Amino acid sequence: VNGDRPRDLVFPGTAGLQLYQSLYKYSYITDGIIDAHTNEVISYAQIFETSCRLAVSLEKYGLDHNNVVAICSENNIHFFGPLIAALYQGIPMATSNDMYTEREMIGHLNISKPCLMFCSKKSLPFILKVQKHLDFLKKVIVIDSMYDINGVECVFSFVSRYTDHAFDPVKFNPKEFDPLERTALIMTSSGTTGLPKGVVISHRSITIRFVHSSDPIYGTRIAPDTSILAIAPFHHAFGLFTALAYFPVGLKIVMVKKFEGEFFLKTIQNYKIASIVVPPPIMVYLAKSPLVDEYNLSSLTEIACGGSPLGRDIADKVAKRLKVHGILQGYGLTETCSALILSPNDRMPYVQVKVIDINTGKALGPREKGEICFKSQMLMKGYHNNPQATRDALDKDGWLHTGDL
Amino acid sequence: VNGDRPRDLVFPGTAGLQLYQSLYKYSYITDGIIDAHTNEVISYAQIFETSCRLAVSLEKYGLDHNNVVAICSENNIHFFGPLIAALYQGIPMATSNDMYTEREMIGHLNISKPCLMFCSKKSLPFILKVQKHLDFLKKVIVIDSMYDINGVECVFSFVSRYTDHAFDPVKFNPKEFDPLERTALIMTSSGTTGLPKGVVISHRSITIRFVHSSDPIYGTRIAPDTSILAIAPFHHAFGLFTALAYFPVGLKIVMVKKFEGEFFLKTIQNYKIASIVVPPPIMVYLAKSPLVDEYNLSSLTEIACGGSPLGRDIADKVAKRLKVHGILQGYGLTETCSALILSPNDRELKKGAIGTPMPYVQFKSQMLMKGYHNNPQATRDALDKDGWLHTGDLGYYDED
Amino acid sequence: VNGDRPRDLVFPGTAGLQLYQSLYKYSYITDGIIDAHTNEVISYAQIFETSCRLAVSLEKYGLDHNNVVAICSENNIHFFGPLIAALYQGIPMATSNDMYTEREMIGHLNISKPCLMFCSKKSLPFILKVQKHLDFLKKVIVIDSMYDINGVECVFSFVSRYTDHAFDPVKFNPKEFDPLERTALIMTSSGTTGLPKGVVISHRSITIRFVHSSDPIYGTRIAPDTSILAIAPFHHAFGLFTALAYFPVGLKIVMVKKFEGEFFLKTIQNYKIASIVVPPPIMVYLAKSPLVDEYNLSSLTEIACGGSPLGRDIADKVAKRLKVHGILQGYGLTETCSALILSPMPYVQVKKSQMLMKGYHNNPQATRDALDKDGWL
Amino acid sequence: VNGDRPRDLVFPGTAGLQLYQSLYKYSYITDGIIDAHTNEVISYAQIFETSCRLAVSLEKYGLDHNNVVAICSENNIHFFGPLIAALYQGIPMATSNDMYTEREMIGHLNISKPCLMFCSKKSLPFILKVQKHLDFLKKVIVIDSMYDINGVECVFSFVSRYTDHAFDPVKFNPKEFDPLERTALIMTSSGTTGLPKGVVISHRSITIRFVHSSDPIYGTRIAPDTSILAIAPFHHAFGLFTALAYFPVGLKIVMVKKFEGEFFLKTIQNYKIASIVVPPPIMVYLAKSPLVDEYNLSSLTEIACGGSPLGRDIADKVAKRLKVHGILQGYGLTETCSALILSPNDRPMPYVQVKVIDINTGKALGPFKSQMLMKGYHNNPQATRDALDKDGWLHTGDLGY
């Protein structure tokens, strides 16, 4: 019923302050994020600057918390500028699956109804196309161009309009607000209902997530200035949050878009990557590989998942094959931010579990093992413009009703 | 007039709570502190337990913030148990020069008047001899023995009376209190005037000193589970606070009592030492020794020097010798958490540790003595309104 | 017919004195035993002190040769404190299988009927239950705790009642007695039949066993301050005597409780271990399982066995695999202390030895059946 | 004072018994002793065989303890055959300075009056000349020849005369005798009294010396099958006892004959030498500048001295120089066998005790008695009575310290 004792106390403020501080702190990291496919690089100090300027720009452009902005890109090195900026101001951000149907995108976007949309070069036509069908979508800004594209502004142009040459990110202040109430992200999944909906994620969810990535047992124990590999889609809770927690711990990131097979091996070997986070299919590819042994995976200290590899000893397959310690396992994870109670190689902080009282509602003891429920500040505050599914998923007094006994 | 923007926000809580979490987190670090002369080792987890138990024990024994405890030991690996425990509770701790004369010692102990005293085996006869002369000095506990010594209790014995086999430091909570008001340490040093006097250190001073050791520019940049070398007396502010800040970063510590430079290098090379904090004399020996090139100091990434301005410029010399980025330290001014204004990892070196003021520092910092103990007139002499200190004369700023 | 001329003359005194001297001699070995699962370490100097204090404490507590003490623990680094201390005093020790049923344990302890029992934290509940059934089992002491457990004392508490801060193991003397008559251990096996009997092992068996571990042909040739691996139960004669012989040679011991896996390989590799003694199953696994090749067994110079592997030439294979030419046979009767034939054995004759069982305990004239009227088998 | 508790209990039997077992044990050591000047090598097993055969031969030839044999050789790898054989049987051995004048040699030999003399080829002419003057010297045997030399027998010829092809050292038994009474060696000192005398060394002295060579604090902590350098004369107590204690420990010996020069610097590196023993003069030359920078401290773990060091404090100098944990200095006078004082691993040997020697009478004072001490001088009861007291104590030469 109570979880473990946090080894790092949750940052009391907003997610933006933690990130801002993390970027000011680790500014000296030159190999900040690298595009494995194009060898393009970005330094922490670049991101620091870009996010701060963009925050100011978003403000002076005239947006506040009652607004909502959106980003739509494939895994991209410039994904994080706008995201962190929105967190600075406290403007809720909505991520978008870069591979949606036109139909899907219009639905998804009709949930949060963003006034501003950031997107990649690659995604730009799609987004203009869709923008025709939504009257609320005022501005679109391209994230990986230094020049405007057919009248569509790029982040640089935009930011230039609102900040000068002498701007200093160090003299910048992120807004302050209740991290438990203020929506950081509005992410969208499909449930049993089969309708899109769209999930609210508070800042405090993120700062707790950060505690976890810091935990020496259930998190990463990798030292700063060390390369990790990011592959999961940044528009999923998995990819976004696992990637976001890279900055406060100060890790160098090498980034891969989709699978590509063995490319995702060339990369580990060649960048000397220490940790990898990966979904189950990647893990099974790891267990069962036609001559994986042609690459020198020797740097791979840590391996992690998020999708539950049911069994068939795949965690063992990967543990034994690559000389890596036990792999993070236990408990199946939900879209709300996923990671909840699990076990290293032994054989969750800010998280509770509830067992007593099938037809009642108050107890504090984990003895008999009846029905199970969850209460953490890291949980979705609910779905967006749909007060109904929020109550059906999470109850009347803050607990969340899981499913089994 | 202002210091650099803090790269890590100061821990809002207690100095003891930050240390508690630090020991909780880095518990896995074996070889926590190593006694270089005797290869005795204490693990982060040992220290966690012993500080927690001892904390409990001080409480049940009946001590609170209106009380005061003391420690007197040479650099000893068991030094930090009583110290961190006292920080856990909010019992003010007074460190003592293990090399005092009886008269000096009774003076020092008569300032803070501690009711309980922790000490080394080595310091024990002296403390007993001294205790005779003090009616306030009720209890003595030995820190580096597993057995009682002629009826004088040891930390194990004391702790067993009040804690069982089933004790879990993880289920322990340090007390909560405004870290800004509660005296952490009362340290002793004279100079001005002449009499000894006794300096007050609040908790948040320690918490700020912790952000400083964390700073990537003015602080250490070494990763946890890597060995650092501590030599300064733990009873002086420089040595204490420098050693205290080792735990929150998760550094493995190799600790040495006396100098005798030969063995010093033996240890750097054999323990693979990455950083050094050091007083000027050992710094000058570093430049001007032949034996330097007999040892493999190749491990020495970072080097630091407090305690003195190293007079002329022996820094450049040593930096070059031991192929280090250049060592660049500051003027620890007063017994107010030692360090206060340092030397940059990305800037001109000019002349003198002028540079740019540390975070949370203007002098007006929360890191300054809160005044010194029960002597209001000279506290008034040094510190006024709005809590400024202006002693060293001088007057050269130059941006910045 | 005779065995090879000894090379090292058997230490004429008691087994305890040879152990005392050996722990004194080394002591500088700071990594005496390591708990492979926990990195817990105890130095030869710690074992020296704790065995001397515990010895003393046993004496003042009031135990002598007419008594019997017992131990029940899984392989534990604190196992050898109680054991050597008894050996110091001349108190016979009874090792006990930590994995016994209550029924089995009660049988075993009813053989020797020890008045005092040492045990691990792990064994403690079991031992208290078993103690309920035995009127002779007066006291229990826990070995791997620095704190007392619900009124059950731990070795520190016990040695503290009877020794001060000022105690010096160097000024301690172990007792003297004809090592040839004084029972060191009472170990328990099934053999002559299927029922429980209890094997008497004299001090002089241990001193001869010590000779064997010293022999440059049949024993190890590894120099002190080098790591060796212990896996066998300390409560079987095999594991005990193999581990006891580590101290006089001054080897660092890395010890593992349960058998085994890749953790065994990781540890050989990471602790850089030079020798292994092992039961047939580990040999047959180390023959097969391919993981042998991704780990660095570079340092594994010597390998030994002891429960006849010669069944399908499994040794041949393993010798070749690792770069270790030659392998140590190992003959196993528990009654024969340890091994008595390998590629003979000094102080041994065949058709026997002083290293041979002295008989079964108290009233078991199965001894007459097992050992004849002029010492042979 | 009492000194330290022996970390190894002294072997109770004879020196020849402990040496016998040590050679059977370490038989497998091929590079047993090496001549640095000739690269000639002798294996532990060769010495095991040669000493056992030779003992048997000495017996059948008809010698017992009432006899006394002598050896005269420069540092020679074949030196230890006669010596260990004499120890096996309990025949007292008298080593002789290979560089004596005829006068001196006739004196030295007139002390112990030995019936049989082993010597090297180099020493043979000298010894025959000297034998002319002594009625008691019946036989001479050459130690480093495989052939007889003008009718003078070599060890081989001799041993063949008395043992066959089927001889097995492993079925050999050395004699049993009180290791406390039986003279092992009779060596000749330079007793500034105005006369040389013959110092008696019991077996028990040797077995104790063996204890010391085993002590992990005061002795060698180097593992078997490791090369050490022997340089001191085997006829001084220094060279003999230090060399002898190499066998029980199973060390490889690299040996150099006379003084040194650079022909000493070369050898450590080339042979990968781990330990060194040297007289004070060699250490004061270790305080010079012959670099010739051969990575020699890559093996030179331990260094030892003994005769009269310190002086200008060359200890520290040499210790920190080629990197040693502080070097082992050793006070002993030949009457003491070897060292009876020494230096640990932090900055009064086992079976050795120490006291103050009130000049008047006293016998107390405030802030040596060992079983390792000479059993007296030879056929000279008066100097014997003067050096060791009537409760066994012996006066150094000099108060202190």
Residue numbers in the entry:
A (entry chain B): 7 to 353, 364 to 421
B (entry chain H): 7 to 368, 390 to 427
C (entry chain A): 7 to 349, 363 to 370, 391 to 416
D (entry chain G): 7 to 353, 363 to 382, 390 to 423
Which sentences did the original study use to describe this structure?
At the core of this natural phenomenon lies a fundamental process of energy transduction by luciferase enzymes that convert the chemical energy stored within the ground-state substrate (luciferin) to an excited, emissive state of the product (oxyluciferin) by a spin-forbidden process. Although beetle luciferase systems share identical substrates and chemical reaction sequence, they emit a range of different colors from yellow green (λmax ≈ 560 nm), which is typical for common firefly species, such as the North American firefly Photinus pyralis (GPp) and the Japanese firefly Luciola cruciata (GLc), to orange and even red (λmax = 590–623 nm) from certain click beetles and railroad worms. Here, we describe the first crystal structures of two rare WT luciferases from Brazilian beetles that emit light with exceptional colors; a luciferase from the head lanterns of the glow-worm P. hirtus (Coleoptera: Phengodidae), the only known luciferase that naturally emits red light (λmax = 623 nm; REPh), and a green-emitting luciferase from the firefly A. vivianii (Coleoptera: Lampyridae) that displays a blue-shifted emission relative to common firefly luciferases (λmax = 538 nm at pH 8; GBAv). Biochemical and structural analyses of the two luciferases, combined with computational modeling, provide the best insight yet into the relationship between the structure and color of light emitted by beetle luciferases.
This assembly accounts for the structural flexibility and increased thermal motion of the C-terminal domains which is apparent from the residual electron density. Only one out of the four C-terminal domains was observed in the density maps of the P3121 crystal form and none of the eight C-terminal domains of the REPh octamer could be resolved in the P1 crystal form. In the structure of REPh, each dimer within the octamer is stabilized by multiple hydrogen bonds between amino acid residue R11 from one of the monomers and Y26, Y30, and N179 from the other monomers, which extend over a C2 axis across the dimer interface. On the other hand, the hydrophobic interactions between M152, Y153, and F162 from two dimers contribute to the weak overall interactions between the dimers over the tetramer interface.
